Coordinates of C-alpha atoms and ligand atoms in Angstrom, one line a residue:
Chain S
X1 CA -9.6 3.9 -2.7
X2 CA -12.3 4.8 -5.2
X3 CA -15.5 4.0 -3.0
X4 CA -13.3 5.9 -0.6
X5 CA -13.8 9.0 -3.2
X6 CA -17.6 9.4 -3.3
X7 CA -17.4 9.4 0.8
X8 CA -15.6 12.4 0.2
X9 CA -18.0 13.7 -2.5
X10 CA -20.8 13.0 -0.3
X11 CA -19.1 15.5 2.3
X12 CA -18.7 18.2 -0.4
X13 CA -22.2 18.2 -1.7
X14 CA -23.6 18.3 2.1
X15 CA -21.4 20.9 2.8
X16 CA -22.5 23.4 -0.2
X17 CA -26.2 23.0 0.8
X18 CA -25.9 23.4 4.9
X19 CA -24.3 26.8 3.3
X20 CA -27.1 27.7 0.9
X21 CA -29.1 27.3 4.0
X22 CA -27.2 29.6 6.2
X23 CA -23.9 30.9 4.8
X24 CA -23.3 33.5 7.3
X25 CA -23.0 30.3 9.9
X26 CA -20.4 28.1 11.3
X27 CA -20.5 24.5 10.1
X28 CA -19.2 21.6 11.3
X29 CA -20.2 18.3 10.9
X30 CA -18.7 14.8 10.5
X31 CA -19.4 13.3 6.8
X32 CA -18.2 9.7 7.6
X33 CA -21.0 9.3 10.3
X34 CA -24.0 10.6 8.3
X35 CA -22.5 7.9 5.1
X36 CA -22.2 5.5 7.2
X37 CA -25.9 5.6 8.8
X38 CA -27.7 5.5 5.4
X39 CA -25.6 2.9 4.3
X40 CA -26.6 1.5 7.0
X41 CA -29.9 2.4 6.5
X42 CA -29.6 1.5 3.1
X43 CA -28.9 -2.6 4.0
X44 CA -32.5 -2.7 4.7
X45 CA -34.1 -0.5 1.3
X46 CA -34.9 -2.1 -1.7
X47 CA -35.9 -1.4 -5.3
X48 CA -36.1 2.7 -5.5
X49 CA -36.1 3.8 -2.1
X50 CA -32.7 1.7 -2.5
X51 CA -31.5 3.3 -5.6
X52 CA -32.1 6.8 -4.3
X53 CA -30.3 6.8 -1.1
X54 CA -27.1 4.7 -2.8
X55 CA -27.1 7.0 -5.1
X56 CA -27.6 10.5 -2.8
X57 CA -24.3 9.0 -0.9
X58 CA -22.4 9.4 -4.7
X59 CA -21.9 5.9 -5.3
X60 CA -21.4 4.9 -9.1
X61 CA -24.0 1.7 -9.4
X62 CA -22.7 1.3 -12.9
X63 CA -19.4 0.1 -11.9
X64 CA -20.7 -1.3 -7.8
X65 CA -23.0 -3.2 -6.6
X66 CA -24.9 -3.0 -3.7
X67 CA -22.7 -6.0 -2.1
X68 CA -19.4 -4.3 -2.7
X69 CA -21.0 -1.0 -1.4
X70 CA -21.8 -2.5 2.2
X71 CA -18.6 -4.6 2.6
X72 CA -16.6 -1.0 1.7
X73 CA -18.1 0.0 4.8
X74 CA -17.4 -3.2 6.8
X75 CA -13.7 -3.0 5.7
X76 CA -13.5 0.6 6.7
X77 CA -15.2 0.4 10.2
X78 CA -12.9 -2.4 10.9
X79 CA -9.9 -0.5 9.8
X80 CA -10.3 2.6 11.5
X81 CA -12.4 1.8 14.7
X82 CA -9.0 1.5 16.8
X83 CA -7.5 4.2 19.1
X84 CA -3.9 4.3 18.8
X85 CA -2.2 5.8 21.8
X86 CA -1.9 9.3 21.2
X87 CA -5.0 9.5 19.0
X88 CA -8.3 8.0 19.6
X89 CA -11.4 6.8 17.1
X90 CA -14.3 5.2 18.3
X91 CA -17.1 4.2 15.8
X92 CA -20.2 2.7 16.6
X93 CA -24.0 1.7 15.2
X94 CA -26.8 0.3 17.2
X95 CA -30.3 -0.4 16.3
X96 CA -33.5 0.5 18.9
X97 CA -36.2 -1.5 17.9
X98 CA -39.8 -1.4 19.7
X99 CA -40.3 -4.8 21.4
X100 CA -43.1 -5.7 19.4
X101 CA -41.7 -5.6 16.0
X102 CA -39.6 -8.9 15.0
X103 CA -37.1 -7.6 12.1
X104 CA -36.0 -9.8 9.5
X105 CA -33.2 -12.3 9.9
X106 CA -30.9 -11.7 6.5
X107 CA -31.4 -7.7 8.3
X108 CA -30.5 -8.6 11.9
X109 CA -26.9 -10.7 10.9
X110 CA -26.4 -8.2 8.1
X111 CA -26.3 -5.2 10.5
X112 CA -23.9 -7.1 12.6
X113 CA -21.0 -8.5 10.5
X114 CA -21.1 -5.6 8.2
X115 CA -21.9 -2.7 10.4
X116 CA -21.1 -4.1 13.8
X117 CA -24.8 -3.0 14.9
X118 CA -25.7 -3.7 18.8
X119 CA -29.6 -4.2 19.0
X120 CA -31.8 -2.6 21.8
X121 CA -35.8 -3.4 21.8
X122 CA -37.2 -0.6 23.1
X123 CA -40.5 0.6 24.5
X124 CA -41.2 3.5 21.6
X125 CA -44.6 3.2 23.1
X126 CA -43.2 5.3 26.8
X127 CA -41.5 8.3 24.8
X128 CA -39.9 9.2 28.0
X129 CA -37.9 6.5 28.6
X130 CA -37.0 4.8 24.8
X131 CA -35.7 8.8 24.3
X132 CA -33.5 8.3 27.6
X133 CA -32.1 5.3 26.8
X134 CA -31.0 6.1 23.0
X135 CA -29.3 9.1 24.5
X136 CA -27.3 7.5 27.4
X137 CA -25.9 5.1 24.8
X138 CA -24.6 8.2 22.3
X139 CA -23.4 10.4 25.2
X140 CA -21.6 6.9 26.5
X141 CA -19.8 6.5 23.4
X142 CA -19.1 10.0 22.5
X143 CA -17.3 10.3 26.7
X144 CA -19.9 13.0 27.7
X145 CA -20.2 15.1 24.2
X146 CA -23.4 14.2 22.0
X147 CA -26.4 14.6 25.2
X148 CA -28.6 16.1 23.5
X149 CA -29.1 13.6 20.3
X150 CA -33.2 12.2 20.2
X151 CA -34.9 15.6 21.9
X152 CA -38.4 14.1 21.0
X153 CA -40.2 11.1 20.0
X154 CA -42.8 9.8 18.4
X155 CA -44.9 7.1 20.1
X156 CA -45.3 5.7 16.6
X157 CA -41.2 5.7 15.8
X158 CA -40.9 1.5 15.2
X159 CA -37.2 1.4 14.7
X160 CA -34.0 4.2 15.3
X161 CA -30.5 3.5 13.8
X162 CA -27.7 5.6 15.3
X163 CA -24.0 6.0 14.7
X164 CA -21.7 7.8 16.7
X165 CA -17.7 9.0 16.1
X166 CA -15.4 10.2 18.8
X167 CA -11.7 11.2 18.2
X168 CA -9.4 13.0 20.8
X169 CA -5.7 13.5 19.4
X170 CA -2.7 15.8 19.9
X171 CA -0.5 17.9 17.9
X172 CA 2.7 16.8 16.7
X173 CA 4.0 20.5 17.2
X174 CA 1.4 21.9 20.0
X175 CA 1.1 25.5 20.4
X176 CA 2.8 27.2 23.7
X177 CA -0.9 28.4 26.1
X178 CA 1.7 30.7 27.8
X179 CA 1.8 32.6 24.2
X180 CA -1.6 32.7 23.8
X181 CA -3.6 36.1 23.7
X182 CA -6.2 38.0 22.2
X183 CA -6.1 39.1 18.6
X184 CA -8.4 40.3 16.0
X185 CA -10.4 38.0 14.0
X186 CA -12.2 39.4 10.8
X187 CA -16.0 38.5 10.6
X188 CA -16.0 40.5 7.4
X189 CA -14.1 43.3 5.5
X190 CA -13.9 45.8 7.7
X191 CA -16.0 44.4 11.3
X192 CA -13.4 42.7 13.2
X193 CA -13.2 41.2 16.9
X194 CA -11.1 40.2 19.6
X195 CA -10.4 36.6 20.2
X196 CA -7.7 34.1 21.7
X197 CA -5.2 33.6 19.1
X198 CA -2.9 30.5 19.7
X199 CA 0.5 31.2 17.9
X200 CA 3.2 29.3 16.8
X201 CA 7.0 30.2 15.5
X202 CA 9.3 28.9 13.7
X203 CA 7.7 25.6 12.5
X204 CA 8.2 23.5 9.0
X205 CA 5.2 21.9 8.4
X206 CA 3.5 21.0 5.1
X207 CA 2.5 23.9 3.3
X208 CA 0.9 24.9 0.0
X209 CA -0.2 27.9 -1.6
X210 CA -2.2 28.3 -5.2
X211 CA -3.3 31.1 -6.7
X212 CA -5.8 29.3 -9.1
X213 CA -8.2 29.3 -6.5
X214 CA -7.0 32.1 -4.5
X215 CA -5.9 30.1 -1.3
X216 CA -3.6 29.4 1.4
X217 CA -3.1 25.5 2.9
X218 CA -1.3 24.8 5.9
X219 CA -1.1 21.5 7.0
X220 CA -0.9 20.3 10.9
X221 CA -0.8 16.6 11.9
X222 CA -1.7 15.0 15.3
X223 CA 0.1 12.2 16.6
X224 CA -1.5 9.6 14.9
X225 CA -2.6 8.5 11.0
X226 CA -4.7 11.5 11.6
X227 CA -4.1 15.3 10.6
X228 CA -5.8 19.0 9.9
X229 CA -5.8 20.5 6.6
X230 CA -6.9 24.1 7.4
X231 CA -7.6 25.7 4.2
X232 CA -7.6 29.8 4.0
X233 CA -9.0 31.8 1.5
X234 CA -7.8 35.7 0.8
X235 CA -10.9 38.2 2.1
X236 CA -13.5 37.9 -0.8
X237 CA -12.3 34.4 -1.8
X238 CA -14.6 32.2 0.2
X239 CA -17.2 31.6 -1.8
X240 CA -15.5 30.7 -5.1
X241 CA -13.2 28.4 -2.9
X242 CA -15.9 26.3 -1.5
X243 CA -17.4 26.4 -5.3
X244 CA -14.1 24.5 -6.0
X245 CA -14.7 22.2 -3.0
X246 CA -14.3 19.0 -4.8
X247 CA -13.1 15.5 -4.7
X248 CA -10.4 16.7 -7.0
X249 CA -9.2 20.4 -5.5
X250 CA -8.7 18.1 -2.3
X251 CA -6.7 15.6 -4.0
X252 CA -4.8 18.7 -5.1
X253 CA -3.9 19.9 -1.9
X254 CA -2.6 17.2 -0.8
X255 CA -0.1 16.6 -3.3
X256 CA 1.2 20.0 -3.9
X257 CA 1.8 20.1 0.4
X258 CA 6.0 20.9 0.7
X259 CA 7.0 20.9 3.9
X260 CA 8.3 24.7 4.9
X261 CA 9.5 26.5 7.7
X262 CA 7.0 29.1 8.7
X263 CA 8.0 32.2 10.6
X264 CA 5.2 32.5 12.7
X265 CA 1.9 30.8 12.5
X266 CA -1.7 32.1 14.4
X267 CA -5.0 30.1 14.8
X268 CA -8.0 30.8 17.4
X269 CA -8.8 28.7 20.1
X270 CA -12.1 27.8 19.5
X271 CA -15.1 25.1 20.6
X272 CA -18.0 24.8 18.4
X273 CA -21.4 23.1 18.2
X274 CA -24.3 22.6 15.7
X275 CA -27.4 20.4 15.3
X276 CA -28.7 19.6 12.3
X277 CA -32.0 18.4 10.8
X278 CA -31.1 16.6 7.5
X279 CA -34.4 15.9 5.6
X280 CA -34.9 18.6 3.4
X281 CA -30.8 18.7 3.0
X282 CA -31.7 14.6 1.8
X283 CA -34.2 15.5 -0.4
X284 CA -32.1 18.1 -2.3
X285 CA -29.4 15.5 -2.6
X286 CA -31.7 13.5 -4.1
X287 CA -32.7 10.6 -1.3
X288 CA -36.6 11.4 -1.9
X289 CA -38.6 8.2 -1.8
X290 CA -37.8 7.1 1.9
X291 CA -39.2 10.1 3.4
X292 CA -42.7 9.1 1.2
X293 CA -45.7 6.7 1.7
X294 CA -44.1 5.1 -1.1
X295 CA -41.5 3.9 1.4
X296 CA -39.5 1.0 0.6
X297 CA -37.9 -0.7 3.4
X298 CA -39.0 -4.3 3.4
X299 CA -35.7 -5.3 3.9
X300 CA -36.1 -4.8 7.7
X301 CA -39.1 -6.6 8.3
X302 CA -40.4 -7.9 5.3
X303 CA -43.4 -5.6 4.2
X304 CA -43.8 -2.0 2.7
X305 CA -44.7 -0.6 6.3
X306 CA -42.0 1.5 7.4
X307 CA -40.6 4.7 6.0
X308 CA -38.3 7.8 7.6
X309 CA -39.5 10.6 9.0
X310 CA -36.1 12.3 10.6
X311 CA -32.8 12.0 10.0
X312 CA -30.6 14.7 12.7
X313 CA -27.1 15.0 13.4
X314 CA -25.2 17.0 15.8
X315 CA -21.4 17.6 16.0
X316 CA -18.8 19.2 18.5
X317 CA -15.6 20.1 17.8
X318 CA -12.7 21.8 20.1
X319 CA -9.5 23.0 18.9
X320 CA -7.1 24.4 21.5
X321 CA -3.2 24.4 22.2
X322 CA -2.4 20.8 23.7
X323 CA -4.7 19.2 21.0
X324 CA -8.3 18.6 19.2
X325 CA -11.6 16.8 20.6
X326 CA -14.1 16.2 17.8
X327 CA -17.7 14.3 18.0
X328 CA -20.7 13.5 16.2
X329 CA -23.7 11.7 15.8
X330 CA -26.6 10.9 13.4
X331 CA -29.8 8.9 14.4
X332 CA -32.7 8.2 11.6
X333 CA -36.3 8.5 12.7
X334 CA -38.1 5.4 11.2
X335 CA -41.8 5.1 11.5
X336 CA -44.9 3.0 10.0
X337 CA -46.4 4.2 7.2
Chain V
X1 CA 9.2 38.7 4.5
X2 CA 8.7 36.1 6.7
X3 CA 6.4 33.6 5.6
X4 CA 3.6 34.4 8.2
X5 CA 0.3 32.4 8.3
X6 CA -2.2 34.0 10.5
X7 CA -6.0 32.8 10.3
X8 CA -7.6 35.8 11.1
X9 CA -10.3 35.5 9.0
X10 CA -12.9 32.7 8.1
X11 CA -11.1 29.6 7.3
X12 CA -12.0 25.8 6.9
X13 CA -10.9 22.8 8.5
X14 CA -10.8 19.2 7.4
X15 CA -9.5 16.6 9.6
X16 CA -9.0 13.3 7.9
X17 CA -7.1 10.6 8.2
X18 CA -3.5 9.7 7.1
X19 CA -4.7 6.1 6.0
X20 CA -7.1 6.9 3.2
X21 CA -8.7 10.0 1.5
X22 CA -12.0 10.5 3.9
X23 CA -13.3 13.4 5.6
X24 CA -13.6 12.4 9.3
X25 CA -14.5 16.2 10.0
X26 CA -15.5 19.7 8.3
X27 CA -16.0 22.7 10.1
X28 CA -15.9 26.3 8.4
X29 CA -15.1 28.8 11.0
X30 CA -16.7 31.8 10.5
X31 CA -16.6 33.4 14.3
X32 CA -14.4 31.7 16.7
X33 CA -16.4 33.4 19.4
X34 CA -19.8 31.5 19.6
X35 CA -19.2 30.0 22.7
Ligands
LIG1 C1 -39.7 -1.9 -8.1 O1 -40.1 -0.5 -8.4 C2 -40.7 -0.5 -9.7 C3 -41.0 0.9 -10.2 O2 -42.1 1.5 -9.3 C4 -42.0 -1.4 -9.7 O3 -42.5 -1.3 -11.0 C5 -43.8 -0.8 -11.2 O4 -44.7 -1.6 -10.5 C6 -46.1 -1.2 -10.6 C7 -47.0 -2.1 -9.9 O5 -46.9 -3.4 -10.4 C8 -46.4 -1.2 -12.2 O6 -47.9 -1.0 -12.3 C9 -48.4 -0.8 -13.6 O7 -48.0 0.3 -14.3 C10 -48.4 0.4 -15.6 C11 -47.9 1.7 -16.2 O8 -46.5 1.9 -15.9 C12 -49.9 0.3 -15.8 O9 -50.3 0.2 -17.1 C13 -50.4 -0.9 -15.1 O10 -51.8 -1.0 -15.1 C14 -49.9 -0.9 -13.6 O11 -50.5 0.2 -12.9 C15 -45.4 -0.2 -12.9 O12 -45.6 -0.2 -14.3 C16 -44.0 -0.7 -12.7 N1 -43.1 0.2 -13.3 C17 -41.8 -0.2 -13.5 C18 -40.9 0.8 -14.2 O13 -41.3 -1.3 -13.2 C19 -41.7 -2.8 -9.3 O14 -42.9 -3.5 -9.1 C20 -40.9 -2.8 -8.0 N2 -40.4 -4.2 -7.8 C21 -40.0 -4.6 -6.6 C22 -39.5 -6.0 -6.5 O15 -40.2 -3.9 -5.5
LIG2 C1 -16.1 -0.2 17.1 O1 -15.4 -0.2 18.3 C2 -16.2 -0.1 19.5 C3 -15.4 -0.2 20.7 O2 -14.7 -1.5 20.7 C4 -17.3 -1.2 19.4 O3 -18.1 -1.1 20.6 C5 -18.3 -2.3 21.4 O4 -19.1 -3.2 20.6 C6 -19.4 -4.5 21.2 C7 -20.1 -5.4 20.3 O5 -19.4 -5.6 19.1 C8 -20.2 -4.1 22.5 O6 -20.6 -5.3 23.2 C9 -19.3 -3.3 23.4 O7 -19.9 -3.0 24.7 C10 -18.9 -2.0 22.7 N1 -17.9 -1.2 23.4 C11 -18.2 -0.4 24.4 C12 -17.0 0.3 25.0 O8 -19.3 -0.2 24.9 C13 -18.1 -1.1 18.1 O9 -19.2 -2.1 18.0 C14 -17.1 -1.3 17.0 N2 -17.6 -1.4 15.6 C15 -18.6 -0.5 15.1 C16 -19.0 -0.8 13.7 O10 -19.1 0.3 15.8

């Protein structure tokens, strides 16, 4: 739907700064997760530090409010927290609060109808431990992935909210592991490297092909209401393609997708990783005021006391033969001002 | 020729979902061989 389009503009905009930061690098993140912890986030800003963040997630405030905004997100969660049988999706939110700190009510029942939040009090006071615990209950949900989430933390940290995203699926036409076999892989125009290339033959799957932006797309699904766009751009063509990553050059895509019968097909097996510090990434997006003295997050408590002071996020993501794992999580850092 | 697709260069990949425009995933692969 239309709130459904600024989710996906919030993944563009994040995706063309991680770059300016370190082009030369793999990326890979999950947008949903990081949208769906400052909205989270977000249910207990007001004023400003409100504003900002609703509106560094691409919302339009002219045409939504703040209510439709959160129950977008409850609708969603509910739709798409359900593993099917070949393909499964986990979501999940939970709140660690210190023990001393008593949170306000409208904030506590809001975080569970809308977000499905699970509160923890926690001793923040122990690092140690409150670090332990936040961790066993991301690695629980993501089956083993995210164990490295919280690294540190501060004896002063009041509050954490963390969100967490699993999916495991297959592919509707999985690739043969007895065919696959070292190939070169291009890290630039003329260095290339040897690397496992999985290969298919003879396949019609959706695929696409516009010169506009100097592109190739190939489309792969996974058993499920769940499927791969991989998008490949000529040598030289990178750049201006993820220029033209856009709400709209997606839309594109996938309307101009004909199914085809492909000769032969080759994509690496690979397994990446990546953590992620989002705060100065936040602050170019525009979601300034929380991270400042000038703070405004009464709607957890009910006082000008608290304020962020990390937001992280790491991600894994394995692509083989049989199928794909994928995983992420984001945790803010929320201390007194 | 044979319509051949052969990522053998830097490519990007976005799993979403069938029921609704969202990006679940992004990755950009620019080395397969990190790990
Ligand atoms: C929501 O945020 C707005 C914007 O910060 C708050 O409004 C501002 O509140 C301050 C403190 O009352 C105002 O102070 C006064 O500023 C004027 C100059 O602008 C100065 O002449 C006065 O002596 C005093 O320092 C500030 O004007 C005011 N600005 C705006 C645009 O509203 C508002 O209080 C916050 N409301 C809530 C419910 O949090
Ligand atoms: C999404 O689905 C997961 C799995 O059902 C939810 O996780 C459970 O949430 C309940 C509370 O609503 C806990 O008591 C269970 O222990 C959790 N499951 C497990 C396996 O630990 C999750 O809350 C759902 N919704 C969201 C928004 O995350």
């Amino acid at each position: 739907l239309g709130l459904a389009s600024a989710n996906v503009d919030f993944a563009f905009s994040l995706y063309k700064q991680l770059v300016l930061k370190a082009p030369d690098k793999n990326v890979i993140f999950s947008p949903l997760s990081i949208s769906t912890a400052l909205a989270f986030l977000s249910l207990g800003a007001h004023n400003t530090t409100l504003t900002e963040i609703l509106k560094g997630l691409k919302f339009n405030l002219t045409e939504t409010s703040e209510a439709e905004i959160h129950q977008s997100f409850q609708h969603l969660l509910r739709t798409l927290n359900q593993s099917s049988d070949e393909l499964q999706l986990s979501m999940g939110n939970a709140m660690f609060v210190k023990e001393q700190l008593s949170l306000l009510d409208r904030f506590t029942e809001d975080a569970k109808r809308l977000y499905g939040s699970e509160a923890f009090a926690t001793d923040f006071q122990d690092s140690a431990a409150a670090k332990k615990l936040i961790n066993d209950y991301v690695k629980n949900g993501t089956r083993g992935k995210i164990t490295d989430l919280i690294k540190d933390l501060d004896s002063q940290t009041m509050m954490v909210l963390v969100n967490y995203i699993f999916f495991k699926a297959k592919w509707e036409m999985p690739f043969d592991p007895q065919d696959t076999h070292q190939s070169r892989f291009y890290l630039s125009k003329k260095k290339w490297v040897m690397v496992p290339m999985m290969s298919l033959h003879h396949l019609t799957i959706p695929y696409f092909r516009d010169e506009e932006l100097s592109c190739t797309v190939v489309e792969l699904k996974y058993t499920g209401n769940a499927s791969a766009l991989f998008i490949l751009p000529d040598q030289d063509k990178m750049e201006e393609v993820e220029a033209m990553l856009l709400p709209e050059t997606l839309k594109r895509w996938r309307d101009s997708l004909e199914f085809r019968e492909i000769g032969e097909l080759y994509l690496p097996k690979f397994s990446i990783s990546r953590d992620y510090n989002l705060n100065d990434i936040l602050l170019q997006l525009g979601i300034e005021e929380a991270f400042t003295s000038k703070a405004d997050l009464s709607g957890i408590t009910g006082a000008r006391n608290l304020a962020v002071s990390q937001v992280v996020h790491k991600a894994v993501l394995d692509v083989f033969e049989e199928g794909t794992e994928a995983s992420a999580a984001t945790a803010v850092k929320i201390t007194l001002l | 020729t044979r319509t051949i697709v052969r990522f053998n260069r830097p490519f990007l990949m976005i799993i979403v979902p069938t029921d609704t425009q969202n990006i679940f995933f992004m990755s950009k692969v620019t080395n397969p061989k990190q790990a």
